[PDB]
Amino acid sequence: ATAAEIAALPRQKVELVDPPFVHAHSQVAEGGPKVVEFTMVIEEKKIVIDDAGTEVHAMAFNGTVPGPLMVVHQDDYLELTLINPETNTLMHNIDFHAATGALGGGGLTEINPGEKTILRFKATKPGVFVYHCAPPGMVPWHVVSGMNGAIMVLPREGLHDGKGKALTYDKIYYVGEQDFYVPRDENGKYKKYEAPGDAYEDTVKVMRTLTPTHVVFNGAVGALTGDKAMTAAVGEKVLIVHSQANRDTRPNLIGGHGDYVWATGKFNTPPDVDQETWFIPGGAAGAAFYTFQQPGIYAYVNHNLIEAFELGAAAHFKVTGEWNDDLMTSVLAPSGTIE
Amino acid sequence: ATAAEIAALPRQKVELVDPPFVHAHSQVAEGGPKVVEFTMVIEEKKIVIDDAGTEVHAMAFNGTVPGPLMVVHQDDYLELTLINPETNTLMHNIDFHAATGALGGGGLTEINPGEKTILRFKATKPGVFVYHCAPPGMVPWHVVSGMNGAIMVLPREGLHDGKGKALTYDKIYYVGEQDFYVPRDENGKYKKYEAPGDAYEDTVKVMRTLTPTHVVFNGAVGALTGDKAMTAAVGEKVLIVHSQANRDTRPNLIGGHGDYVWATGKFNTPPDVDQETWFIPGGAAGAAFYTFQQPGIYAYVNHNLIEAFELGAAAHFKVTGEWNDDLMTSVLAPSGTIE
Amino acid sequence: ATAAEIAALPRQKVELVDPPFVHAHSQVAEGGPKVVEFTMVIEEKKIVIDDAGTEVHAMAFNGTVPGPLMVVHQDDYLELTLINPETNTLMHNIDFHAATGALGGGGLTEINPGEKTILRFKATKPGVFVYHCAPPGMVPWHVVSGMNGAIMVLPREGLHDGKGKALTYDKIYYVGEQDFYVPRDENGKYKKYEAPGDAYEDTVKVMRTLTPTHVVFNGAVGALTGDKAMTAAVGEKVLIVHSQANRDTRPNLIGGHGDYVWATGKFNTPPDVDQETWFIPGGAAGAAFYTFQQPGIYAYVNHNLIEAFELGAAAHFKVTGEWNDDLMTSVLAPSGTIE
Ligand SMILES: [Cu+2]
Ligand SMILES: [Cu+2]
Ligand SMILES: [Cu+2]
Ligand SMILES: [Cu+2]
Ligand SMILES: [Cu+2]
Ligand SMILES: [Cu+2]
Ligand SMILES: [Zn+2]
Ligand SMILES: [Zn+2]
Ligand SMILES: [Zn+2]
Ligand SMILES: [Zn+2]
């Protein structure tokens, strides 16, 4: 399309929401291509990632870890206004894996504190894609400090299974998984720092061991458990988007399954079906579709159980509805062996 | 189905066998749905995992690591009687990834020493699935102490390739891969303990490094080599089921291939073909079908060769038959360069 | 085929070239099956892998790491002459994952310094496959010392996508990824050794931590950057073959995509499409096809960004051509917020 043609397309401004929720959108595209505008501010701030008060200097899109999920349709143009407040201390940029050219846009969006930039790119391929900060010479550091998220480019006709059957979800959740590398002092205790830059040297050496100290969903151990559990009802169809910008993960819905799973996260690649545990390589986003059939609590985890239960990669789903004894029943409840 | 309908289905009691062998079963389902009954006892016992006398306090279904493979057909009901002897010391339960609801059955099967329980669930999805113990607050510990196995839910019509062609195996083997985390003393030697509970604190810290000390098949280094090598003959069709309840693995048949591989382990997902090395994420089971064409010894390994040859993840296949020179021949045997 | 029939097939001698380039070949097979002859010499030599002068005693096919890529067509016979000079110190052999029998040929090609051997095998399955040294009792050590490469067995009719559409590449590059495990002294500095054998004991203990000190493409940090960047032009179709003989990797073309990706590396398995980051398990080779649409520099990396930017797994692509503003444009260049 020409500049004039693009300038004549209808525009739509979207207000982003904090994960795990997603901004309002329609699954089937309404009309022709549009220019969808999003705005994000970068915040460098301290966040507490566990119940022991462990602090990390996060670098976060819209102040959250992960950054928010953006949704557009294939062939729409995504126009992002990115702002780096004058009160931040580092240069930042953004690389969209969904985009084509200039290192995903990273080479055209380098902004120092006090600057802003506006990038537009055509969303040519459908699927869920990772986006993350990637400043020359400090790439992994900004990423493992939480500066990453994902976007979803829906086919204009919505989701379909491998044989054209339409798949409409009632709810959608976005789980961003993050590997953190927190330095410890000679006593085995987590160190604290004044400014982000003061934690750099120590962080890099932990990073080089390739072993994270924490692996969490939505920015903190237990961030998605208890009262903050994701919800659904028996019969509801749910789409769970999962991203990991730096490290492999293996999602699994304990008590459930992945009915249709785009493990590679790309919609033109037929989904795998009936999955127990799927795999998402570091630097990618994946999506799983599931229809709940039983009520109760479900654990959604990274299935390397040490990472899930010892490092923090575990979330909950609280589902309401009626129990189906055909699917599963306790014939004899736990009881003493009668001698 | 209603309670009355399920109670009227024919019942079949199965006697489980120790891995790598599998209990007798038919590939094609005989008649209508049945209730298949299995019984497992939990044993907490010390096992020796290498040739240096390294001991670990195992927690094992039917006394083996991995637990035995259970086979049913899609839509059959699996009814398990699980027994925790009064002489054990910990609470245990079971979570079937093949099941739907109550954390895979884990929430309905918590039993203390001296108790038993009976769980029934409908095997609605075909494929190989992991099952493992998962007691609240001690999940990874029971799993990496060997309390896991797999089940296979065969399509009622048996296995088929991606285009409907039937695939009948002559033999089937089950290889359970286990990551162990054994604590070492200030001298670098493996520590020993009196009771399972006494090794907990030390084990957890090794677990947190995410680096296993041993990665073995069938419970011990060399468990499936030498005289205990799995066997086959040229022309025979073999199905190899492989599971890893906690950590990624990458199976490879050295000298052979994976003709048809359900790397995700789910039969409704077409298999990948002609594989050299396939990948099974932690928390999943996979299956590979191969027809031997050459006799001799084959090495079946986790292809991170350090894990295979240094940590223990290597097994053997001894195949009988006639050599095929068309497929491979030594034109000039190793010999001195004639100067 | 019989011995006489094979002896009557036309023969073709190929001169191998150093990676990342590939020897001349035709994508579509010309005529009937042939016997393709290749010759490789093994060199045990010291190579420098980073800019800090870190030395490693490499074991390399034709003196390079990775060894060169060999290309044949399905059903061709590959006949390799392998030479171990009298000046080397260790026994070596070769295992082709593309071959069937005798541990990939490893059991028929064990040669001491001063010996040579000639092996022939039929290339029955199409796809890219790993090949590596694997001497009994020292398998992982020869592999992580760089003694591995890959071969490509093209379908006789050339590459096709999932629905029969032909895929012809203008250029092909071979990126061999290598995990190195270099021992450090009590001061944290990399140790040096006189002979390969003198570094063995120390290397094995680093290997057991399963954590590499370097992860590089084409044998050294920055080997494929700057003036040695791989090249292409907008509109050109490029095939990138990637192998890792021992450890998982997750390739990603920053700024681009994997239009068609055979992540398992086997051509009879339909490719995944529109990939951002793909996964290649250790012990396998994969291939990605991409048509450049934007000029500029692209980074081709292992997307665990710590491994890419801290350990060395990063290469460059320099692409010429005209910028496409429809695909991406800087609407507002980085500029100060006007207060
Ligand atoms: Cu940043
Ligand atoms: Cu990226
Ligand atoms: Cu248990
Ligand atoms: Cu599980
Ligand atoms: Cu060698
Ligand atoms: Cu191999
Ligand atoms: Zn696949
Ligand atoms: Zn008693
Ligand atoms: Zn001589
Ligand atoms: Zn101001």
Listing DSSP states for C103-172 in one string gives GGGGGG--B-TTEEEEEEEE--S-EEEEEE---TT-HHHHHTTT-EEEEEEE-TT--B-TTS-B---SEE
Q: Do C103 and B272 touch (CB under 8 A)?
A: no
| C-alpha–C-alpha distance, residues A128 and A239, integer Å | 12
Q: Which two tokens stand for residue A278?
A: 């799927």
Q: Do C273 and A283 touch (CB under 8 A)?
A: no
Q: Which two tokens stand for residue C122?
A: 């039929």
Helices (H), C166-312: 200-207, 305-309
Residues C148/C250, Cβ–Cβ less than 8 Å = no
| C-alpha–C-alpha distance, residues C199 and C207, integer Å | 12
Provide the β-strand partners of residue C103: none
Residues A238/A292, Cβ–Cβ less than 8 Å = yes
Q: Which two tokens stand for residue B256?
A: 């052979």
Residues C120/B315, Cβ–Cβ less than 8 Å = no
* Residues, chain B: 339
Any binding-site annotation on C214? no
Q: Which residues does chain B have within 8 Å of residue A325's beta carbon, measured at their own beta carbons?
A: 3
C-alpha Rg value of chain B to the nearest Å: 21
How does DSSP assign C283-337, residue by residue? TEEEEEEEE--S-EEEEEEESSHHHHHTSS-EEEEEEES---TTTEEEEEEEEE-
For B111-168, what is the HEC assignment? ECCCEEEEEEEECCCCEEEEEECCCCCCHHHHHCCCCEEEEEEECCCCCECCCCCECC
Residue C214, amino acid: H
Tell whether B296 is within 8 A of chain C (Cβ): yes
Other beta carbons within 10 Å of C116: 19
Tell whether B305 is within 8 A of chain C (Cβ): yes
Question: Nearest C-alpha of chain B: how many angstroms from C80?
Answer: 9
- Residue whose entry in the numeric block shows the structure tokens 């055209």: A108
Q: Which two tokens stand for residue A323?
A: 């129990």
Q: Which residues does chain A have within 8 Å of residue B113's beta carbon, measured at their own beta carbons?
A: none
A: neighbours with 3+ CB pairs under 8 Å?
A: B, C
Q: φ, ψ for residue B311 (rounded to 5)?
A: -95, -15
Residues A243/A149, Cβ–Cβ less than 8 Å = yes
Instruction: Tell me how far the alpha carbon of residue C85 lies from the centroid of ligand 9, in angstroms.
Output: 9
Give the burial class of A300: count Cβ atoms within 10 A of its Cβ; 0-12 exposed, 13-18 middle, 19 or more buried: buried
Q: What is the resolution of this structure in A?
A: 1.8
| C-alpha–C-alpha distance, residues C282 and C266, integer Å | 15
Q: φ, ψ for residue C141 (rounded to 5)?
A: -60, -45
Q: Do B328 and C105 touch (CB under 8 A)?
A: yes
Interface test with C, best of A97, A144, A178, A180 (most C CBs within 10 A): A97
Tell whether B79 is within 8 A of chain C (Cβ): no
CB pairs under 8 A between B and C: 168
Nearest to B42 by CA among B18, B59, B19, B65: B59
* Residues, chain C: 339
Residues C151/C72, Cβ–Cβ less than 8 Å = yes
Q: φ, ψ for residue B143 (rounded to 5)?
A: -65, -50
Query: By three-state DSSP, how is residue B253 classified?
Result: strand
Residue of A nearest to C329 (CA): A120
Helix (H) or strand (E) holding B7: helix B3-7
Dump strand ranges (E) for chain A: 11-13, 35-48, 55-61, 70-73, 77-84, 95-96, 115-122, 127-132, 148-154, 171-180, 214-217, 230-233, 237-244, 251-254, 258-262, 272-275, 284-291, 296-302, 314-320, 328-336
Residues A238/A171, Cβ–Cβ less than 8 Å = yes
Residues near B52 by beta carbon (within 8 Å), at least 6 away in sequence: B190
Nearest to C61 by CA among C100, C88, C25, C97: C88
Residues A156/A113, Cβ–Cβ less than 8 Å = no
Number of the ligand closest to the Cα of B338: 9
Torsion of CA C305, C309, C310, C313, to 10 degrees: 90
| C-alpha–C-alpha distance, residues A179 and A188, integer Å | 19
**Binding site residue list of B for Cu cation:** 92, 97, 132-133, 142, 147, 303
Instruction: Tell me how far the alpha carbon of residue B339 lies from the centroid of ligand 9, in angstroms.
Output: 6
Residues B260/B237, Cβ–Cβ less than 8 Å = no
Query: By three-state DSSP, how is residue B208 classified?
Result: coil
Q: Which residues does chain C have within 8 Å of residue B308's beta carbon, measured at their own beta carbons?
A: 139-140
Tell whether B272 is within 8 A of chain A (Cβ): no
Torsion of CA B172, C127, C43, C175, to 10 degrees: -120
Q: Which two tokens stand for residue A175?
A: 């789980």
Nearest to B219 by CA among B338, B58, B82, B78: B58
Q: Which residues does chain A have within 8 Å of residue C330's beta carbon, measured at their own beta carbons?
A: 108-109, 117-119
Nearest to A47 by CA among A184, A218, A203: A218
Nearest to B245 by CA among A179, A308, A281: A308
Near ion ligand 3, which residues have CB within 5 Å?
B 59, 92, 133, 142, 147
- Residue whose entry in the numeric block shows the structure tokens 């951002």: C276
Among A102, A127, A283, the residue with its CB nearest the CB of C255 is A102
How does DSSP assign A220-247, residue by residue? STTTTSGGG-EEEETT-EEEEEEEESSS
Other beta carbons within 10 Å of A113: 16
Q: Are strands A214-217 and A148-154 parallel, antiparallel or unpaired?
A: unpaired
| C-alpha–C-alpha distance, residues A173 and A17, integer Å | 12
How does DSSP assign A4-63, residue by residue? HHHHTS-EEE-----TTS-----SS--SS--EEEEEEEEEEEEEE-STT--EEEEEEETT
Nearest to B203 by CA among B176, B225, B220, B184: B184
Residues B34/B77, Cβ–Cβ less than 8 Å = yes
| C-alpha–C-alpha distance, residues A158 and A73, integer Å | 9
The DSSP letter of residue B304 is S
Method: X-ray
Q: Which two tokens stand for residue B278?
A: 């396939």
Any binding-site annotation on C73? no
Residues B263/C281, Cβ–Cβ less than 8 Å = no
Long-range contacts of the stretch B182-188 (C-beta < 8 A, 24+): B182/B49, B182/B54, B182/B56, B182/B206, B182/B213, B182/B214, B184/B213
Any binding-site annotation on A23? no
Instruction: Tell me how far the alpha carbon of residue B243 lies from the centroid of ligand 4, in angstroms.
Output: 12
Provide the β-strand partners of residue B8: none
| C-alpha–C-alpha distance, residues B244 and B280, integer Å | 7
Distance of CA B157 to the CA centre of its chain: 23
Residues C282/B249, Cβ–Cβ less than 8 Å = no
Give the burial class of A4: count Cβ atoms within 10 A of its Cβ; 0-12 exposed, 13-18 middle, 19 or more buried: exposed
Could you tell me the CA-to-CA distances from B37 to B63, B97, B121 in Å, in that order?
19, 18, 11
| C-alpha–C-alpha distance, residues A236 and B59, integer Å | 38
- Residue whose entry in the numeric block shows the structure tokens 């309908």: B5
| C-alpha–C-alpha distance, residues B284 and A272, integer Å | 14
Give the burial class of B151: count Cβ atoms within 10 A of its Cβ; 0-12 exposed, 13-18 middle, 19 or more buried: buried
Dump strand ranges (E) for B181-303: 214-217, 230-233, 237-244, 251-254, 258-262, 272-275, 284-291, 296-302
Q: Do C304 and A247 touch (CB under 8 A)?
A: yes
| C-alpha–C-alpha distance, residues A159 and A262, integer Å | 11
Number of the ligand closest to the Cα of C87: 9
Residues near B22 by beta carbon (within 8 Å), at least 6 away in sequence: B69, B71, B172, B173, B174, B241
Tell whether B209 is within 8 A of chain C (Cβ): no
Can you list the domains of chain B with their CATH numbers? 8-155 (2.60.40.420), 156-322 (2.60.40.420)
Q: Which two tokens stand for residue C287?
A: 């291939």
Residues B284/B148, Cβ–Cβ less than 8 Å = no
- Residue whose entry in the numeric block shows the structure tokens 């790397």: B263
Q: Is B231 left (phi over 0), alpha (psi -120 to 50) or beta?
A: beta
